[PDB]
Design a protein around this ligand. Sequence first.
Ligand code: AG
Ligand code: CA
Ligand code: CA
Length: 285
Amino acid sequence: AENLYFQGHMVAIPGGTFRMGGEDPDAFPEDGEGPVRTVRLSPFLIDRYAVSNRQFAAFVKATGYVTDAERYGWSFVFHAHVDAVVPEAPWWVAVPGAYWKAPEGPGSSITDRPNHPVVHVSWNDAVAYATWAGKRLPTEAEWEMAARGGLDQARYPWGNELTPRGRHRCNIWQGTFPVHDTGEDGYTGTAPVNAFAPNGYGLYNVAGNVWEWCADWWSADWHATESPATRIDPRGPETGTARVTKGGSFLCHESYCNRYRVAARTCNTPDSSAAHTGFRCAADP
Ligand SMILES: [Ag+]
Ligand SMILES: [Ca+2]
Ligand SMILES: [Ca+2]
């Protein structure tokens, strides 16, 4: 497609059909990456850039908005970035005072990261921002069609090679997780929202950098059946306990979590927040 066009921070995608999901050998099959399924979408707009600290700051200045992490008093921080740990993921520490303005908790700031994605934003925070911006969150199908950038069943936004020609195309982890990030892709942490090359629809950092909240309630099997509801502008199940997140983050590494593949998916309760999770907005024409 090329009746696509740019407007503001966004790209208008004139609707289309794509093969969603994946059945690759290195998938998490239990996540419901499969089955591969053909999905048709109505026209939509989606941010080509995740929402930045500067943008979130303007929202808070204009509204006085208080994030869930501020209300709870703590958010999840990666251990090496300065029991209170997640037993199943002990590199995550519950840090009092970690929030969007202090991403590693006390002693950190965003003064030198104005163009990085805002983090420690919950699904509720994302929705609040998007609504103020006159936007919404993307559905998982909109997110993934946009992230695929016009390629059919590629592993990544740009193709099937993680580092085509040996060049980094996204901000994830290199080295030995979780003890040593070599920063080969340039960043031991988040990167500016316009880092690396855009994909075929102009989107930056759909793979890597930060996880991105989607609109959908999480299910591993709702989309398995073939129906208009699951294949034409699919919205996901009517209820659920966690909301979908897509794209992976600067902590992803193939030794344990390869979910920067565009077919991959996970979820978190909508009041949760963490140092590696942000969002980008969508809209309708
Ligand atoms: Ag991952
Ligand atoms: Ca990195
Ligand atoms: Ca991402």
